[PDB]
């Protein structure tokens, strides 16, 4: 299977990844307003599969700790969303055997959408208020099957986004955690045995987002 290693110690919050996701899928823009933050859209939605969350933490002396979290589906090894959807109708949520992608199909319109979102420990699924279809990150599974990187990985200028075979990516994550700890001693990997999107947090993951980890 495939894996993302997301080294958040390298993120400049450029939001290339946020735009790249929408360009590749030709997703519409939300109506947004500035409510006193750079963060926008404020949340994942039916039409936003990735948003960069911004958090400012006070620190001693000049500046802040500015935490950036490009949020997406974790493509869980044993996805609760599928376990919940499969109650109502199998085939609404499937797992690709080759990549390990967890994939919502058109049959999500027939299942209890609200219930599938509740099953997700990362609060990822979003419902279309018209068609009741569920959407989220699909790992750019078609690009991946065709030997391309996911749009958000290829676009990333900093090396925050990394993608490959689970074995090379777990080894990269372990090696990078050791190097990053030299700058950020409280660095941790997010749920690295349970998911296919492994984040390196520079500190308590919950500082980045309340559902950063399960």
């Amino acid at each position: 299977g495939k894996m993302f290693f997301v080294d958040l110690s390298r993120c400049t919050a450029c939001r290339g990844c946020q735009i790249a996701c929408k360009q590749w899928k030709n997703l519409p823009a939300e109506e947004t307003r500035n409510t006193g933050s750079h963060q926008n859209p404020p949340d994942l939605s039916y039409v936003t599969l990735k948003t960069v969350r911004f958090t400012e933490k006070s620190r001693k002396g000049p500046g802040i700790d500015w935490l950036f979290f490009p949020e997406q589906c974790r493509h869980c090894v044993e996805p609760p969303c599928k376990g919940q959807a499969d109650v109502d109708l199998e085939g609404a949520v499937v797992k690709d055997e080759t990549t390990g992608a967890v994939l919502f199909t058109e049959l999500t319109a027939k299942v209890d959408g609200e219930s599938v979102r509740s099953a997700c420990p990362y609060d990822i699924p979003r419902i279309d208020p018209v068609t009741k279809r569920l959407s989220k990150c699909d790992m750019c599974n078609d690009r991946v099957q065709n030997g391309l990187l996911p749009a958000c990985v290829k676009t990333c200028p900093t090396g925050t986004m990394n993608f490959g075979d689970e074995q090379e990516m777990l080894a990269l994550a372990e090696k990078r955690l050791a190097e990053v700890k030299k700058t950020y001693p409280g660095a941790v990997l997010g749920d690295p045995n349970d998911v296919r999107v492994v984040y390196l947090f520079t500190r308590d993951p919950k500082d980045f987002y309340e559902h950063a980890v399960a």
Binding site: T12, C14, G16, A29, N40, P41, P62, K154
Partner: protein, 964 residues
């Protein structure tokens, strides 16, 4: 197969936004016969490796955009609507306005009887957004028509760099390139927000960190850059020279300079004349009447033969290095800490980390962009950086340099093509009214009697002659010299620049303005003044992607179309991915891009618009005669066109240049029609043409070197990322300028592990050597008259050493360093109703006035409205909560914005008072989107500089109040 890309043709392009020059891949429907279907990064491009920031990543939405102009629009005097018109009508009527205005205004001789052959009734703004071939053709069209008021973006963010670095090193260019940042041991980012404003640069900055580099951000604000640096050091607005002066003192006191480099390669050993002095904030030769220096008082002591005297022992008290130590002794840690607001602990940390790069096998780089270098002493800010880099041996080396980051994709190119009032292409000066002949023009170039000084500019007659042969190939250069307009020798150069063009416009002194690929109704300081001033034009031509605040100024806020008599032509141009040609990035990489989709609707590439417009003017003169027709009738435009269209390829070949006859030059025999292989083979006798001598070597008999996509590197090239077979950089593919400074006098690199050049088997290996000759036989700075990196820089108006003069006026009354408060060679009101320092800056997601990015739904989605960033302290003072609407006001205007309350802004302590900074983005305007807000330039003064001609957009006084 991916269905989306199946059946589409793949072409390569270069991003149309910032000067990083990221590679794109464009997919165009119907095997190239339809619209773009996808735009993303070029995975093979050596700078971005497929990465794009949100601006590059949204180019699909920019190009395939239903809000884009579809055809020319016409607005009649006093009309309140556009009328759609044909290209034939628009360009015929524009040509008639050009000819009518020129015929009525053209002056052969000025008041003093001097030949000037110009019109002062038409001005042009733009543009760094056009391709290099377009910028070159555009300048030549405007000058053939007799214009002198020719300006663009470069005046604001580029112009201060050129003389600071030219004084120091001999060229104004960024010294290294983007990939080279990965070779640095310490990266100082100061007056730059590179993670937001040059985002792919951080690929290479973070690679330097991976190899053990320290990353330092010095900025009044904590930004997305600051988040990813090892050290964030806050600095008070305008306290940069104190900061850098303190670093110079720290280097000298602690003996951290690269002794052998300083002795051999800088002017450290040169003996300054006894007439040089500095006392109480003034250098010798000060004229208090005319607020000007007699710079002859700063001259070097010359030897019997006219060569500046040298003491290689560095003992003589008038050695540059000893005068330098004496000048900076005042910049002690306590004083510098007090004025910068930087703690002594942080200054020591930053100075220790950066000055450690004075070790021969360590390299430090300085990255700066626009920052606050606008003010009258910005040149001296950049001078201080150059001097630090020369003391540390960081110039000419991998991971070193002054990385003066260019703004726009082709601001390097547009400046190189002379779209500024003072320069022709290739940085040959525009003649003044006293340069009565080509011989007198050429007489001005200083000579050197030092046989080790290359003094390359002595070749200028070859470049000026070859330029005149490119324009007027049937004419002797001495005769063609009289065709082009001249500025008055009697006037301040700044009378011809950006800010005075707006002033003259407000006095009704212009009939016509070209707003060509710019949005001056949003980009000019004091927008209320400039918007009103545009109503005093008879005609306005706006060439642009979309209807905008400039095209439609006449129906802007508080404007009555019925009272505004300006005739406006809106000509819609095509996006970058719809045309072919080159753009020159910040590292001087001249990169070729290709047409993907055909032009949207009836949009046209700039080259076709300007050429058709000029051809119509030409036709009119052929039928009607008129004012001095020769410069127009005789211009060589046949070399610009193929198959009835503007030909980027043919213009690029002309810019490189070709032999007009069989010619023997520098040992070799050349044949009529052969491309010039390099500027080394240009002649002053009319045997050669070249539109731009810097381009000689770019498009040779070997073909278009700008179009090379070859990643082939030797080990030594690959170790530092030169990519010499990827595109082409001026000059003659020298990727790192001044690289002779990177080796000792035997040609051994100071740092073999990061060699730039090396002497091996009677040859320079690695980069192209910046100046031919055996090791130890030439001074390394070949464009300098004397051959040396200038620590002491006596061509500078403000003095040969940088000195703190307060660029803040309103909150400062004392100078800790002298009794001279403000720049003594430089009318702020400081009305107490506006107690806060307003500043404008950028965000990653928007571009310039936002004309382009406010049309891109994914960028508006992320940054939908003008905001106002303030400290918790100011928020408490004014009772502003995060997300409240606030009114920001100045003497010049007022606007509303959403408050962002953040610890990323902190108060400045200035002369024992807390002074608050108010931050605004300048990316918004009234046209689009819904509730986006208007330009921050409603607030800014059109008070700029008799030195620079540049407005104050980084520190201007405002109030902020909560709205209910």
């Amino acid at each position: 197969e991916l269905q989306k890309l199946q059946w589409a043709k793949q072409t390569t392009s270069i991003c149309c936004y910032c000067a990083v020059g990221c590679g794109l891949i464009v997919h165009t429907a119907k095997d190239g016969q339809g619209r773009a279907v996808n735009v993303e990064g070029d995975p093979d491009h050596p700078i971005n490796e497929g990465s794009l920031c949100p601006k590059g990543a949204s180019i699909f939405q920019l190009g395939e955009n239903d809000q884009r102009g579809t055809q020319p629009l016409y607005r009649a005097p006093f009309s309140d609507t556009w009328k759609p018109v044909t290209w034939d009508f628009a360009l015929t009527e524009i040509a008639k306005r050009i000819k009518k205005t020129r015929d009525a205004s053209f002056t052969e001789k000025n008041a003093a009887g001097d030949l000037v052959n110009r019109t002062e009734a038409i001005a042009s703004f733009g543009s760094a957004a056009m391709d290099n071939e377009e910028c070159w053709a555009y300048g030549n069209i405007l000058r053939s028509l007799g214009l002198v008021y020719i300006e663009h973006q470069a005046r604001i963010x580029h112009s201060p760099t050129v003389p600071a670095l030219a004084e120091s090193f001999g060229r104004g260019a960024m010294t290294n390139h983007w990939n080279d940042l990965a070779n640095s041991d310490c990266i100082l980012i100061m007056g730059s927000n590179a993670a937001e404003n040059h985002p792919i640069a951080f690929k290479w900055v973070l690679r330097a960190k991976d190899k053990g580099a320290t990353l330092i951000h010095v900025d009044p604000r904590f930004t997305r850059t600051s988040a990813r640096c090892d050290v964030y050091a806050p600095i008070r607005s305008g306290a940069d020279i104190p900061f850098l002066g303190g670093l110079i003192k720290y280097i000298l006191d602690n003996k951290l300079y690269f002794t052998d480099y300083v002795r051999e390669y800088t002017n450290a050993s040169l003996i300054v004349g006894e007439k040089f002095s500095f006392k109480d904030g003034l250098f010798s030769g000060y004229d208090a009447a005319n607020k000007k220096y007699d710079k002859s008082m700063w001259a070097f002591e010359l030897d019997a033969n006219g060569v500046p005297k040298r003491d290689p022992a560095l003992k003589h008290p008038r050695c540059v290095i000893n005068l330098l130590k004496k000048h900076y002794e005042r910049y002690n840690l306590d004083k510098v800490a007090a004025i910068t607001g930087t703690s002594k602990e942080q200054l020591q940390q930053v100075y220790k980390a950066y000055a450690a790069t004075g070790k021969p096998d360590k390299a430090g780089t300085i990255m700066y962009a626009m920052g606050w270098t606008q003010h009258s002493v910005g040149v001296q800010n950049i001078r201080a950086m150059a001097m630090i880099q020369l003391l540390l041996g960081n110039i000419g080396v991998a991971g070193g340099g002054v990385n003066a980051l260019r703004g726009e994709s082709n601001v390097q190119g547009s400046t190189d093509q002379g779209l500024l009032a003072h320069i022709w292409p290739g940085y040959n000066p525009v003649p003044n009214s006293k340069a009565a002949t080509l011989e007198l023009y050429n007489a001005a170039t200083p000579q050197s009697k030092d046989p080790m000084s290359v003094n390359w500019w002595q070749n200028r007659p070859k470049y000026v002659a070859s330029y005149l042969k490119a324009l007027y190939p049937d004419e002797e250069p001495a005769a063609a010299y009289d065709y082009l307009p001249r500025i008055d020798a009697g006037r301040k150069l700044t009378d011809y620049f950006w800010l005075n063009i707006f002033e003259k416009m407000d006095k009704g002194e212009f009939k016509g303005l070209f707003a060509w690929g710019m949005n001056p109704a949003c980009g000019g300081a004091n927008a209320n003044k400039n918007r009103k001033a545009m109503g005093k034009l008879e005609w306005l031509v706006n060439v642009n992607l979309f209807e905008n605040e400039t095209s439609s100024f006449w129906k802007g806020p508080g404007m009555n179309p019925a009272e505004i008599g300006t005739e406006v032509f809106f000509l819609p141009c095509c996006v970058s991915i719809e045309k072919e040609g080159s753009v020159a990035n910040s590292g001087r990489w001249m990169q070729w891009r290709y047409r993907g989709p055909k032009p949207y609707a009836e949009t046209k590439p700039d080259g076709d618009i300007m050429l058709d417009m000029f051809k119509k003017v030409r036709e009119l003169y052929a039928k009607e005669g008129g004012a001095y027709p020769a410069p127009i009738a005789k211009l060589n435009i046949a070399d610009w066109e193929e198959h009835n269209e503007f030909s980027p390829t043919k213009v690029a070949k002309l810019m490189n240049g070709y032999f007009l006859k069989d010619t023997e030059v520098g040992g070799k025999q050349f044949k009529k029609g052969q491309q010039v292989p390099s500027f080394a083979f240009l002649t002053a006798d009319g045997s050669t043409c070249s539109g731009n001598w810097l381009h000689a070597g770019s498009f040779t008999d070997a073909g278009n070197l700008m179009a090379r996509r070859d990643k082939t590197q030797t080990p030594e090239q690959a170790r530092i990322g030169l990519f010499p077979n990827w595109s082409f950089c001026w000059p003659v593919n020298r990727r790192i300028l001044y690289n002779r400074a990177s080796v000792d006098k035997t040609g051994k690199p100071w740092n073999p592990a990061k060699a730039v050049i090396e002497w091996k088997d009677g040859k320079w290996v690695g980069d192209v050597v910046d100046g031919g000759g055996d090791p130890g036989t030439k001074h390394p700075f070949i464009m300098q008259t004397h051959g040396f990196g200038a620590l002491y820089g006596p061509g500078r108006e403000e003095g040969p050493f940088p000195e703190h003069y307060e660029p803040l006026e309103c909150p400062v009354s004392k100078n800790p360093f002298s009794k001279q408060l403000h720049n003594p060679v430089a009318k702020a009101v400081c009305d107490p109703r506006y107690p806060f320092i307003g500043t404008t800056y950028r965000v990653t997601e928007h571009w310039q006035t936002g004309l382009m990015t406010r049309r891109c739904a994914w960028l508006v989605e992320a940054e939908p409205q003008i905001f106002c960033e303030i400290s918790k302290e100011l928020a408490k003072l004014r009772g502003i909560g995060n997300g409240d609407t606030v009114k920001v006001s100045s003497l010049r205007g007022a606007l509303e914005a959403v408050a962002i309350v953040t610890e990323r802004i902190r108060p400045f302590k200035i002369e024992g008072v807390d002074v608050h900074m108010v931050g605004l983005p300048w990316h918004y305007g009234w046209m689009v989107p819904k509730n986006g807000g208007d330009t921050a330039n409603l607030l800014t003064p059109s008070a700029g500089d008799p030195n620079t001609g540049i407005p104050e957009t980084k520190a201007f006084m405002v109030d902020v109040r909560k709205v209910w």
